[PDB]
C-alpha cells in the first residue's frame, strides 16, 4: 500500500483562470505517476504520464509537475469541457488511485425551468401514483423543492435526483417525485411543487387540480 | 484496431463467484501489454484491483482475502477475464478492463480504458420496468422508468433523432429495493401535437424493450 490522497475535494472555477489539483503520495513515488480525466458517464483518460509529460491528444492547457511525495495537476484556463472528476495514480507495477477531485466550471446563475407532471391515467390503475416535478437547466446546484398536498407539506415521501454538469451549459437538471397511493391521491384535489433558487426573487410554484 | 468490451454478469448473489471477461481486439494478449481490472463503487473513485502482463505472465494483486481474486488469461480467444469469489454488498461497482504501455520510464499507466460493465451484488431477483408517459414559450415532456432491478436503463427519445434539451436522470432506489427512473426533455411550446414523441426504453437484464409514446 501506498495511500494517494488528493485535495481539494471539490473546484468551482470560471473559465480563463487556473485550478491547481494536488496529490500527496504516503512513500516517495519519484515521477511515476499519471493523471486521469473521467468526463461524467464516461471512462477515464490519461491526461499526464511520468508526473510531468502531456499524453497524446490532450489540450495544452494541462499540465503536470511534483517529483517525491507532492505532484500537482494545472489547468491553465478552464473551458466549460472541463467538467469531470480527476485522478492521481502511482505506479509500480501494483497501482494506486487517489481518491479524485471534483471539478466544477462556475456559471452565471441561471434560474430554473420549473415543470410538474400529473400522474397518468394508467398509473392509477395500479394503485400507486407519482408526481413528478422538474428543474431544467439551472445553477448553481443547491436547491430546495417543497411539494405541497392541498396547501399543506408533504415531507417524508419524495426523492430527488440531480444530473451531472452539463459539459456545455453548465447546469444542473433535478427531478423530484412524489410517490402516492390511490386512494390517497384521489383523496386530494390540488397538488404542487415549489422551489426556491438563487436565481429567483421569489419562489415560483406549478400546480394541478384533480 | 484497438478495442477493449467487458463481459459478464449484472447481477450476482452474495457469496458467488462473479465472473467478468474483457474482449481485446486489435493487439494480441500476448505482447507484453499489462491488463488490469479497476472498479469504481457508487460515489466513491477508482480502486485498483489485479494486473497481469502478458509475456511475462507477471500478476500484481491488491490486498484481498487469501484467493479471492483470480485473473486468468486466454490467448486462444485472445481476452483476459476476472474472478472474485466470495462476493459480498460491498462489491457492487462498475468494473473497467484497460491496457497498461509503458513509457520512457519503464513503468506502466493505463493508457486505452472499456466502457464498463457494471455488477450488483444483493439477493434481489430481476424485475422489468414499467413506463409511464409524463405530460403536463417551452414545454417539458417525459417518461417515468419505475420499478426495476438491476442496474442500468438506456433511454433515448425518438430513436436517437432528437438529443438536444434531453435529460435522463440518475436512477433512484426507493423504499422497495427497486429503482425509479425519469427521462425529459425540453420542448417548443407549439409542439404538443405537431410532433410526436416516443420514448425508447430497453432494460437488458430483463430484456424489456418498449417504444412508449406520449399524449
Known amino acids: 500500500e501506498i495511500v494517494m490522497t488528493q485535495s481539494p475535494a471539490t473546484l468551482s472555477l470560471s473559465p480563463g483562470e487556473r485550478a491547481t489539483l494536488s496529490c500527496r503520495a504516503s512513500?516517495?513515488?519519484?515521477?511515476?505517476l499519471a493523471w486521469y480525466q473521467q468526463k461524467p458517464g464516461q471512462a477515464p483518460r490519461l491526461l499526464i504520464y511520468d508526473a510531468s509529460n502531456r499524453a497524446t491528444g490532450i489540450p495544452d492547457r494541462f499540465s503536470g509537475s511534483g517529483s517525491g511525495t507532492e505532484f500537482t495537476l494545472t489547468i491553465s484556463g478552464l473551458e466549460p469541457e472541463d467538467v469531470a472528476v480527476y485522478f492521481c495514480q502511482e505506479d509500480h507495477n501494483w497501482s494506486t488511485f487517489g481518491q479524485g477531485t471534483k471539478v466544477e466550471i462556475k456559471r452565471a446563475v441561471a434560474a430554473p425551468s420549473v415543470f410538474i407532471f400529473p400522474p397518468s391515467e394508467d398509473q392509477v390503475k395500479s394503485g400507486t401514483v407519482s408526481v413528478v416535478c422538474l428543474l431544467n437547466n439551472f445553477y448553481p446546484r443547491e436547491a430546495s423543492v417543497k411539494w405541497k398536498v392541498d396547501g399543506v407539506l408533504k415531507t417524508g415521501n419524495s426523492q430527488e435526483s440531480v444530473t451531472e454538469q452539463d459539459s456545455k451549459d453548465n447546469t444542473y437538471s433535478l427531478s423530484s417525485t412524489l410517490t402516492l397511493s390511490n386512494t390517497d391521491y384521489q383523496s386530494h384535489n390540488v397538488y404542487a411543487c415549489e422551489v426556491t433558487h438563487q436565481g429567483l426573487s421569489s419562489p415560483v410554484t406549478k400546480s394541478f387540480n384533480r | 484496431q484497438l478495442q477493449l468490451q467487458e463481459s459478464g454478469p449484472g447481477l450476482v448473489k452474495p457469496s458467488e463467484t462473479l465472473s467478468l471477461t474483457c474482449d481485446v481486439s486489435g493487439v494480441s494478449i500476448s505482447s507484453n501489454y499489462g491488463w488490469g481490472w479497476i472498479r469504481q463503487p457508487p460515489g466513491k473513485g477508482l480502486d485498483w484491483i489485479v494486473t497481469?502482463?502478458?509475456?511475462?505472465?507477471?500478476?500484481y494483486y491488491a490486498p484481498s482475502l487469501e484467493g479471492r481474486v483470480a485473473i486468468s488469461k486466454d490467448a486462444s480467444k485472445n481476452q483476459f477475464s476476472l474472478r472474485l469469489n466470495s462476493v459480498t454488498a460491498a462489491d457492487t461497482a462498475v468494473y473497467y478492463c484497460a491496457r497498461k504501455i509503458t513509457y520512457s520510464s519503464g513503468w506502466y499507466y493505463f493508457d486505452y480504458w472499456g466502457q464498463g460493465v457494471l455488477v450488483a451484488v444483493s439477493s434481489a431477483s430481476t424485475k422489468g420496468p414499467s413506463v409511464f408517459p409524463l405530460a403536463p414559450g417551452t414545454a417539458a415532456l417525459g417518461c417515468l422508468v419505475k420499478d426495476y432491478f438491476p442496474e442500468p436503463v438506456t433511454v433515448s427519445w425518438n430513436s436517437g433523432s432528437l438529443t438536444s434539451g434531453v435529460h435522463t436522470f440518475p436512477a433512484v432506489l426507493q423504499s422497495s429495493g427497486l429503482y425509479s427512473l425519469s427521462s425529459v426533455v425540453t420542448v417548443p411550446s407549439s409542439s404538443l401535437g405537431t410532433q410526436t414523441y416516443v420514448c425508447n426504453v430497453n432494460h437488458k437484464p430483463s430484456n424489456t424493450k418498449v417504444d412508449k409514446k406520449v399524449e
Open positions: 512513500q516517495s513515488v519519484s515521477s511515476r
Open positions: 497481469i502482463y502478458g509475456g511475462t505472465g507477471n500478476t
